[PDB]
RNA sequence: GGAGGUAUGACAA
RNA sequence: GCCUAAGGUGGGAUAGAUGAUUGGGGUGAAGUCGUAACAAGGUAGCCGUAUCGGAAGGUGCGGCUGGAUCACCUCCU
RNA sequence: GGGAGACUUGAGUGCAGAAGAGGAGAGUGGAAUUCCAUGUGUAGCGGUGAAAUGCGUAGAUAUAUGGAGGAACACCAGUGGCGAAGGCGGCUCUCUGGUCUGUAACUGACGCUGAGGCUCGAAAGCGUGGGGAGCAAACAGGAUUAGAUACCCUGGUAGUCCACGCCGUAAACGAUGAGUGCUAAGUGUUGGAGGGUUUCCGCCCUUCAGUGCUGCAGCAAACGCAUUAAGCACUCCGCCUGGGGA
RNA sequence: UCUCGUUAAGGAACUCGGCAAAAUGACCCCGUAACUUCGGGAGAAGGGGUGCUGACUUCGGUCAGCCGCAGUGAAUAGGCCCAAGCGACUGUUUAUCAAAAACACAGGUCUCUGCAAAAUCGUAAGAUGAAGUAUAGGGGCUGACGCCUGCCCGGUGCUGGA
RNA sequence: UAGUCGGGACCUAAGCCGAGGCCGAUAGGCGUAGGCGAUGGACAACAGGUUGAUAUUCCUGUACCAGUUGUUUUUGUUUG
RNA sequence: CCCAUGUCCAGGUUGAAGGUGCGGUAAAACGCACUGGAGGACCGAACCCACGUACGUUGAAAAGUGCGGGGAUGAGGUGUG
């Protein structure tokens, strides 16, 4: 649930946060933790390549089993855990043979559920099957784009996709964005939608909290100088004062499409959206 | 349920064959009221059934008032067994 | 026969 | 020395007066604009609500007959 | 009126039955509209009092085959049913309220009304998140007209739909508060019950509770009401006291 | 001239401006308005008490007495109030003449992006974005919250058509 | 003046270097294995005394850590 | 500006959510206490900052000092690499 803080301070005023009710532990699985340094938007040349990233809290990476290709044994859900690296929660599962893994927690997943993966798995939340084995109309997430590569699509909190049909070696899927496309039928997906649906409703509340979450401030181009931004300069506040608004590198910011016009996947995208 | 109703009737019957009496009626109304409350919390938009719950509550209250005005010893005995207030 | 339903124009005289 | 009237200071409470300006309302034998209602009032009217328009009002949604006319079945004399 | 008893008719429980678009949740069906794709096909289509805007040779409308999506549920359907009212109409299941009829085993006046409080409450509207076929305030264009910020036409956004939370108002009307008893008849119909016939089917009669129509007594300013009273009575509540200003 | 102390009567008449200085200052107690997002506004304001010595104590006082001009006796610890503009707020900035009404901000909205994502660094390889995946990431504008955000698509851009 | 302090003969972070490798007019750029790299991890002694100037470093007392040689004691010799 | 790894913030104050008890109720909402210890929270040293003013202006100083001033658990200060 979302808890609304009382306005004890102006910073606390209008702020909200999740009450983390679904989280059953705060002791992550040591075996599955890996270190990640904060790149702060800087690449192997040490240059800022993505603005507005850096600082904030330290994090340990939780190795998520996106492939879900262990089909022999079932895995019992042990915990629902907070994952600082993604908007969704993750579930610690113990395979009967003693192998431990993390998965994305689907909506409605509960501690104690027994999950299976493979062509013969039931159509149940948390089970992962090849798309060819999933009946049409089923809500799915964690869709892999290439066989054996692991889930890549529909992984953020509250997201879901739906199977629309089978044509050839491809399954017609509606993605979370509304786009309808073909995914290779040998690709696997997990049944259900991603949990933590309330994630989008959080009112961050104060600037410091965004800094905790590794976001550095955005400066508007209009309040820069002309040598910094096409919107820079002018006396006083100014309008855009150009044909169209542009990025710092002169690329139109309202409406101009940036997808490669010769994309290979265009053959596989049936109906676009976003 | 007629089975659950009869077994409550036998547990609280003032004597053999006593179906009607403040104790029997109140107790049966008490399990009826509890079950309908569970339904109410699951179906919070079922306003029409909730009105049935309220009439059950008022009838139970009226019978409790009659029992208290009539035999305060019985009234205290009953409310303890059913856990009322 | 009966019944519920499907543009403008004083004032008094 | 205690109590204490009056007096002084302070922040509130309460009642009337007055105030640039402002709001709708009532009045005013014969002003301007339209014609909304009363007949089916010429788009039936009215109710609540929303929205728009100089203005009466218009339009949408639901409701009412306190509905003119011709056309049906049930009912009943 | 108070106190101690007794009672069973009011009220309730039990037992046995009856009907129902009563409510909530989750699914699901066909018809139709729209859009989309593909054939066929060729210059119109659409619309009005008459027109035009609009759509169409960038191939329409029509027609065929499919696909998507939303909303509403033809026939049944009925002064028919259910609900306190607002209201409830495809079908299926799950949860759930109430009512009615017999019986007379049980309780033994436990009842009625109910200021204040609480709950529910059409439509429009509001907030957050979805959806969006059709319809359609606003709005645009075309007309009509003296003018038209209308009626008419072509479009069309909110809204209409869903979830959750607000709002709390309607010619929210039977413009008739609730409870109880009493006071001619006739005739429909919905759900019951009992009996007399009928080979059954059904018909006959008695009856309970609804729902209508007609109509005495009585009532009413009149209109009209009339066992579903606006009649004859008792209890409690709400409300009224010339019109306007409100 | 600088730095510091005291000043009769007056008390902002000074001055662009109460600049500077003065005054307030601790603790306890009484008490505390408009307005409000119901948290606040408040330490609002405005007042009272404070030393010493006995007696007595429920251990905080109370009673009584005593001295001084003065008792947080020195030092160090808010001046306050009314009202208007602007910015919601804490923050940030012109190192060295500008700390602000500027930037940022949470919130809003638009748009791009189906993942070898868009975007960016690079001739490239290789990276960042992300060991992220549309509730995510980039970009433009607006800038808490409340109520709201009307008309114009001819022009220019963008998008689609072809 | 130190087996015991701090550093090395221990460890890894960021980062850096980088066999082959990938890329590129030249130069070189990037990068795998492998390493380097503390500001972190690990790690055995203390009190007093002493000099003009050093001391947990010298000295006194009493310790600890790793290892070496020998003596005695136990037990194991390839079902160990 | 960022990365990895350390480290610093005297002392007071306020009293958010949650919890408990007792009232309240059909159950609730909810009221009152207590507990609880939130915050780019409050007062205030160190620490960081640099708002006013005087002075300095061949300076004590190529930007400071005096008296006051703001922040001071954070979008914080600061060390090492
Ligand atoms: K805030
Ligand atoms: K998370
Ligand atoms: K900005
Ligand atoms: K500018
Ligand atoms: K009219
Ligand atoms: K009605
Ligand atoms: K039933
Ligand atoms: K709405
Ligand atoms: K009848
Ligand atoms: K003077
Ligand atoms: K104040
Ligand atoms: K004194
Ligand atoms: K002070
Ligand atoms: K500012
Ligand atoms: K701001
Ligand atoms: K503002
Ligand atoms: K400042
Ligand atoms: K700035
Ligand atoms: K706003
Ligand atoms: K943005
Ligand atoms: K703009
Ligand atoms: K923003
Ligand atoms: K334009
Ligand atoms: K244009
Ligand atoms: K050493
Ligand atoms: K070290
Ligand atoms: K200074
Ligand atoms: Mg950004
Ligand atoms: Mg500038
Ligand atoms: Mg330029
Ligand atoms: Mg410019
Ligand atoms: Mg200007
Ligand atoms: Mg007229
Ligand atoms: Mg009319
Ligand atoms: Mg009329
Ligand atoms: Mg209009
Ligand atoms: Mg509505
Ligand atoms: Mg009313
Ligand atoms: Mg009848
Ligand atoms: Mg003087
Ligand atoms: Mg003097
Ligand atoms: Mg002056
Ligand atoms: Mg002067
Ligand atoms: Mg001053
Ligand atoms: Mg002093
Ligand atoms: Mg500011
Ligand atoms: Mg500030
Ligand atoms: Mg400067
Ligand atoms: Mg300055
Ligand atoms: Mg701005
Ligand atoms: Mg060492
Ligand atoms: Mg290298
Ligand atoms: Mg080489
Ligand atoms: Mg390595
Ligand atoms: Mg050591
Ligand atoms: Mg020395
Ligand atoms: Mg603070
Ligand atoms: Mg401070
Ligand atoms: Mg320092
Ligand atoms: Mg600075
Ligand atoms: Mg402050």
């Amino acid at each position: 649930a979302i808890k609304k803080y009382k306005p004890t301070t102006n910073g606390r005023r209008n702020m909200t946060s999740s009450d983390f009710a679904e989280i059953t532990t705060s002791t992550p699985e040591k075996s599955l933790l890996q270190p990640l340094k904060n790149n702060a938007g800087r690449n192997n040349n040490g240059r800022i390549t993505v603005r507005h990233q850096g600082g904030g809290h330290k994090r340990q990476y939780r190795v998520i089993d996106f492939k879900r290709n262990k089909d022999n044994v079932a895995a019992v859900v042990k915990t629902i855990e907070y994952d600082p690296n993604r908007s969704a929660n993750i579930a610690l599962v113990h395979y009967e043979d003693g192998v431990k893994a993390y998965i994305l927690a689907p909506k409605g997943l509960e501690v104690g559920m027994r999950l299976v993966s493979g062509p013969e798995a039931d159509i149940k939340v948390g089970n992962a099957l090849p798309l060819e084995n999933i009946p049409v109309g089923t809500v799915i997430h964690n869709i892999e784009m290439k066989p054996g590569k692991g889930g890549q699509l529909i992984r953020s909190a509250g997201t879901s996709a739906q199977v629309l049909g089978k044509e050839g070696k491809y399954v017609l899927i509606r993605l979370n964005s509304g786009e309808v496309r073909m995914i290779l039928a040998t690709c696997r997906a997990t049944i259900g939608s991603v949990g933590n649906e309330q994630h989008e409703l959080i009112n961050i509340g104060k600037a410091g909290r965004s800094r905790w979450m590794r976001k550095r401030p955005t400066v508007r181009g209009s309040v820069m100088n002309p040598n910094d931004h096409p919107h820079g300069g002018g006396e006083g506040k100014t309008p855009i004062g150009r044909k169209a608004p542009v990025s710092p590198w002169g690329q139109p910011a309202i409406g101009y499409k940036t997808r490669n016009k010769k994309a290979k996947s265009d053959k596989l995208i049936v109906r676009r959206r976003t | 349920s007629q089975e659950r109703k009869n077994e409550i009737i036998k547990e609280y019957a003032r004597h053999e064959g006593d179906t009607g009496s403040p104790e029997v009626q109140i107790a049966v109304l008490t399990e009826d009221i509890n079950q309908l409350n569970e339904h109410a919390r699951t179906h919070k938009k079922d306003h029409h059934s909730y009105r049935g719950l309220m009439k059950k509550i008022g009838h139970r209250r009226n019978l409790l008032a009659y029992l208290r005005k009539t035999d305060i010893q019985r009234y205290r005995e009953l409310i303890q067994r059913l856990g009322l207030r």
Side-chain angles (χ1 to χ4, degrees):
Chain A
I2 296 290
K3 62 179 161 188
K4 305 184 182 309
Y5 293 120
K6 287 176 178 307
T8 49
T9 53
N10 282 342
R12 215 67 159 177
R13 185 182 303 275
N14 294 312
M15 178 186 292
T16 73
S17 76
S18 61
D19 73 350
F20 303 114
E22 76 296 9
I23 305 306
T24 62
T25 193
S26 51
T27 296
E29 173 59 38
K30 177 176 175 174
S31 315
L32 301 173
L33 298 186
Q34 295 297 308
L36 281 179
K37 64 150 289 190
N38 192 339
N39 297 290
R42 294 160 160 81
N43 79 337
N44 71 343
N45 297 330
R47 304 276 185 86
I48 291 166
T49 56
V50 185
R51 302 188 303 167
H52 314 144
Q53 304 196 358
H57 207 294
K58 181 179 197 178
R59 298 173 180 167
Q60 290 266 79
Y61 186 66
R62 284 91 172 124
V63 186
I64 315 305
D65 175 25
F66 290 117
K67 301 194 174 178
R68 296 291 305 273
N69 61 2
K70 192 181 206 299
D71 305 334
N72 176 235
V73 300
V76 52
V77 174
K78 289 277 125 174
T79 77
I80 311 308
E81 304 193 13
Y82 181 88
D83 185 340
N85 311 287
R86 65 195 74 265
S87 60
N89 296 323
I90 64 177
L92 177 60
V93 310
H94 291 172
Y95 290 92
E96 294 163 313
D97 58 13
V99 161
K100 300 178 169 175
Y102 275 128
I103 57 156
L104 301 181
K107 172 175 182 65
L109 197 77
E110 283 296 347
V111 173
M113 287 187 176
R114 285 186 156 274
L115 315 181
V116 176
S117 64
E120 286 74 54
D122 191 3
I123 303 297
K124 305 261 65 175
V125 177
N127 286 0
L129 296 85
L131 280 167
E132 54 196 325
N133 298 89
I134 304 187
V136 165
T138 301
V139 184
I140 57 170
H141 62 101
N142 194 37
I143 315 179
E144 79 185 349
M145 294 209 63
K146 303 182 189 183
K149 182 177 179 177
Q152 284 187 283
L153 314 181
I154 316 307
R155 307 198 315 192
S156 188
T159 58
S160 71
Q162 186 176 118
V163 178
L164 301 186
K166 330 273 178 163
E167 66 185 66
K169 56 168 69 182
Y170 287 93
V171 170
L172 191 71
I173 299 295
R174 184 185 283 112
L175 300 177
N176 196 92
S177 61
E179 161 175 325
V180 178
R181 65 165 293 157
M182 282 150 57
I183 287 171
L184 207 55
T186 51
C187 293
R188 296 199 177 192
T190 300
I191 283 70
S193 62
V194 187
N196 193 14
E197 189 191 8
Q198 65 185 18
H199 169 73
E200 204 176 11
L201 302 186
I202 289 158
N203 186 308
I204 298 292
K206 67 170 183 178
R209 196 174 180 196
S210 291
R211 304 300 303 274
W212 301 341
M213 296 154 52
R214 307 192 169 186
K215 274 60 174 182
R216 295 194 76 257
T218 294
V219 174
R220 294 170 294 103
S222 171
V223 288
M224 305 189 180
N225 290 322
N227 66 308
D228 305 315
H229 203 290
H231 298 182
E235 294 295 297
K237 282 175 176 55
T238 59
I240 297 290
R242 286 169 61 98
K243 276 179 160 53
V246 294
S247 74
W249 306 273
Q251 192 182 57
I254 307 288
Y256 171 78
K257 291 182 174 180
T258 64
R259 178 178 168 80
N260 190 315
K261 308 180 193 312
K262 280 199 291 183
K264 304 294 292 292
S265 64
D266 272 332
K267 181 177 73 62
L268 302 172
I269 293 177
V270 180
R271 197 189 325 274
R272 278 186 63 76
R273 188 70 214 181
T274 60
Chain B
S1 181
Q2 187 144 318
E3 295 289 349
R4 175 272 311 167
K5 176 173 72 172
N6 286 324
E7 72 110 12
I8 293 178
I9 285 166
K10 298 168 195 178
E11 178 169 332
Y12 281 87
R14 195 118 288 273
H15 59 84
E16 185 70 24
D18 167 52
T19 68
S21 70
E23 291 83 18
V24 168
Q25 295 186 42
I26 288 165
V28 168
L29 282 168
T30 293
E31 274 304 284
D32 289 345
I33 286 166
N34 290 334
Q35 242 176 323
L36 196 47
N37 274 286
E38 313 314 330
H39 168 88
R41 294 145 187 164
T42 300
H43 303 262
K44 305 174 194 182
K45 261 61 188 185
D46 188 6
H47 297 308
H48 289 56
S49 301
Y50 209 96
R51 181 169 177 265
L53 169 67
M54 294 300 293
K55 289 170 80 62
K56 275 179 167 69
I57 289 161
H59 191 222
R60 204 246 308 261
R61 185 185 300 108
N62 289 317
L63 293 177
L64 283 167
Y66 166 78
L67 186 60
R68 196 184 68 82
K69 179 194 177 176
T70 296
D71 190 327
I72 194 174
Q73 290 299 74
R74 281 193 290 162
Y75 169 79
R76 281 168 183 157
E77 171 62 62
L78 174 71
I79 62 174
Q80 284 286 17
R81 304 174 63 190
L82 293 172
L84 301 177
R85 190 179 317 291

